[PDB]
Design a protein around this nucleic acid. Structure first.
Ligand SMILES: Nc1ncnc2c1ncn2[C@@H]1O[C@H](COP(=O)(O)OP(=O)(O)OP(=O)(O)O)[C@@H](O)[C@H]1O
Ligand SMILES: Nc1ncnc2c1ncn2[C@@H]1O[C@H](COP(=O)(O)OP(=O)(O)OP(=O)(O)O)[C@@H](O)[C@H]1O
Lengths: 465, 214, 72, 72
DNA sequence: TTTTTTT
């Protein structure tokens, strides 16, 4: 009782678990030791033609006809009901010919790599011979790395963060901070960007500046769409906001960028949600300024500093006189060509995985460093210098009461000029007049029609000198 | 390309176009002042795999409403990859292989000037005028020129008919053999631009503190 | 859904409940398309959906928020 | 071309290289479409292009700028 | 803000 032959062929193909359906509406196939999906080519027919050697002899002859292949594809589409979830392992690095385990280090190939439904890859094959610590390329690469970010007591704290942020690019989780590479010209940050791109293949992606300026929901926005399921997104050439007419990056969008999902749609599609598995790195020479500064913004900022100059001999003199640098080196003419030739593709992957094994093994999280945030520093200082009144200050109010304070309904009354003079004794009120005014009308409280008071008691008001 | 009118800018442009065929491209002014993310931009999407891009007729900036050259656009225009989406497509990456040449009669001015901008600027001057016999006399008393010659009537037709298509190609090949054999690189000329002349001296007559000078 | 042909999937799925002489006819895609066309032609009236506000849907059934037991 | 199937033109042009038994089969456009479908099915893996910066491409050949030799 | 995407 042998029925349709093409149905049997389709059933046997489906039994190998080589075609799967995702919740996004796409079909993924397992061909050439990788998971590939696309909406414009017949991948199912390619798989049917490719796997014809695993079937009995009486079945392989039927797959040469394209119409029979189309019939088998239609059957397979009919029998595929039930979606599956993909990209759920954050500690696995997919390649073209297998998946590398970042936890311990062995490389999986073939069926062993099938269980990890990694729908993306690095786009190139993995080679074991070049993945070794002792190679002529390693010493050359270490010299460049030490030149860009020298290791020393002065730079010991910044280099650790610089390597930790680069190492974080290997994970497939969501990151809660953004990276700003602040440096002058010829500081080697572009070389680092190119090295990272060559190391991580097409997982690296570059998008326009508009993902920080406009509204992400203003019609189609392929720039956000291309970010989907990436692990590193680079934005470049921040415009200078000091000059008039420049548009200051909104604080709203950076908070959205730290959410596990982003709202945006591509062309010829209606899907909105996109997985945010990537880290944001933006390189610039000017420190950015935000329209509004809030307490939520200091949990989502991180800055790396570049303080090395690679100058030609003709500019040897002036580079020494400039105070923004700390070391001057001779520019390498042929370095760019070697970088473009993927000369350090695996020597940098070894460094990346070695760094990953150092920091990111137990948990992935960063420690904020508010000790060096000059642009927000004053906003911190008041927060660390003002103590509000409470119940414990009620018994001691009388001593403060003789110092110009009136106990009206158990509320401390603070004259305006007293706080004006106290803050103007060190801060030039002319420079931050607008900022102080904004803080005031955001924090002003009306005791009555005329008198205005502040709900804080200065430490020096109660502590004897 | 800096020079007055009737100095051979368009003749050189057409000679290069006839020499290099489809590898030459002509693009609008929007790539220098207009934002590259304001929807689709086919002007920069047409630069894919091109080897020479020309833009001509820079307007004077003294006119009201004139937009000056953005420094950030210049900085991001020299990158190996340029971001731009042509119409009816989703691709946003274009490969940059072309030399950008701007033809103008006035010295350009930028909104912001910094050490980054001084590294990507070169200027070449045209100092020869071809004049008709009627108005040639008024050309010997002008400092903008150093030699006055007679206009050739039929040169444009010869240039159009691709008469010198291969001679120019041979000359270009000889020049490439002369210069770009070991390493190909273009070097900037900060001095020519007038507005930079301030900053160039700033790093010369000022020095920082020294341990011996403390 | 408006993209994949769920009708053909249903036709292929429920082929076991049909008599023995009808199951073998559903293994060909063209017959499935003809059956789908007939079904689409035979459907005229419409029905309103989601009329019960106190029911929580799942895959293995619907949970009732009044009593607390789970249908399946 | 992003909108024209040049594969059919290539199939028609490459006819003379094949033996005479297969030569007459390519005159029918439907056979050419079938061959194009087969070729598109067996074509997996992408190849990068334009990796040589010192070569000048022409319509009937490529010129080498290193030594001036012309290849066709 | 009319184009763009939509057809
Ligand atoms: N260790 C090194 N030794 C010598 N030359 C180096 C070294 N690292 C980089 N260089 C060279 O010095 C230059 C570094 O400048 P780069 O192109 O990185 O620009 P940048 O100012 O750092 O950044 P961007 O252009 O992205 O703003 C390049 O020409 C590079 O080839
Ligand atoms: N030896 C020569 N070299 C170049 N052009 C010549 C020469 N002899 C005569 N001419 C003529 O001189 C003219 C070249 O200048 P033309 O008036 O065309 O200005 P242009 O190149 O468009 O310059 P600009 O854009 O600065 O105005 C052409 O008409 C050309 O035929």
């Amino acid at each position: 009782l042998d029925g349709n032959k093409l149905f049997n062929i389709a059933q046997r193909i489906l039994d190998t678990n080589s075609v799967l359906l995702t919740e996004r509406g796409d079909h993924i196939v397992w061909i050439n030791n990788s998971w590939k999906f696309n909406s414009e080519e017949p991948l199912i027919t390619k798989l049917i033609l490719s796997i014809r050697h695993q079937l009995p002899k009486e079945y392989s002859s039927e797959l040469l006809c394209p119409r029979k292949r189309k019939t088998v594809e239609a059957n397979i589409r009919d029998m595929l009901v039930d979606s599956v979830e993909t990209d759920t392992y954050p500690d696995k690095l997919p390649f073209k010919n297998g998946v590398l385990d970042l936890v311990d280090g062995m490389f999986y190939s073939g069926d062993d790599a099938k269980k990890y439904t990694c729908t993306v890859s690095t786009g190139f094959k993995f080679d074991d011979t070049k993945f070794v610590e002792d190679s002529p390329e390693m010493e050359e690469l270490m010299n460049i790395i030490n030149d860009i970010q020298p290791l020393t007591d002065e730079n010991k704290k910044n280099r650790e963060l610089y390597e930790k942020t680069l190492s974080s690019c290997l994970c497939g989780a969501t990151k809660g901070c953004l990276t700003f590479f602040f440096g002058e010209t010829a500081t080697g940050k572009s070389t680092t960007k190119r090295l990272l791109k060559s190391a991580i293949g097409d997982l690296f992606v570059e998008t326009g500046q508009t993902i920080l300026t406009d509204v992400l929901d203003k019609g189609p926005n392929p720039f956000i769409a291309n970010m989907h399921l990436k692990r590193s997104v680079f934005c470049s050439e921040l415009p200078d906001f000091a000059c008039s007419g420049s548009k200051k990056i909104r604080s709203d969008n950076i908070k959205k960028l730290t959410e596990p999902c982003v709202i945006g749609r591509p062309c010829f599609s209606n899907k909105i949600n996109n997985r945010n598995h990537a880290t944001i790195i933006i390189d610039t020479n000017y420190k950015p300024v935000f329209d509004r500064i809030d307490n939520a913004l200091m949990r989502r900022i991180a800055v790396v500093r570049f303080r090395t100059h690679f100058s030609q001999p003709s500019g040897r003199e002036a580079a020494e006189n400039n105070d923004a640098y700390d070391k001057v080196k001779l520019l390498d003419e042929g370095l760019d060509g070697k970088i473009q030739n993927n000369r350090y593709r695996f020597a940098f992957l070894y460094l990346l995985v070695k760094w990953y094994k150092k920091y990111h093994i137990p948990i992935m999280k960063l420690y904020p460093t508010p000790e060096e945030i000059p642009d927000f520093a004053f906003y911190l200082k008041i927060g660390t210098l003002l103590v509000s009144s409470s119940v414990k200050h009620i018994p001691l109010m009388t001593d403060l009461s003789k110092k110009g304070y009136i106990l009206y309904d158990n509320v401390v009354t603070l004259p305006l000029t007293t706080f004006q003079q106290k803050i103007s004794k060190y801060f030039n009120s002319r420079l931050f007049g607008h900022d102080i005014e904004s803080f005031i009308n955001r924090h002003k409280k009306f005791a009555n029609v005329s008198d205005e008071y502040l709900q804080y008691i200065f430490i020096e008001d109660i502590s004897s000198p």
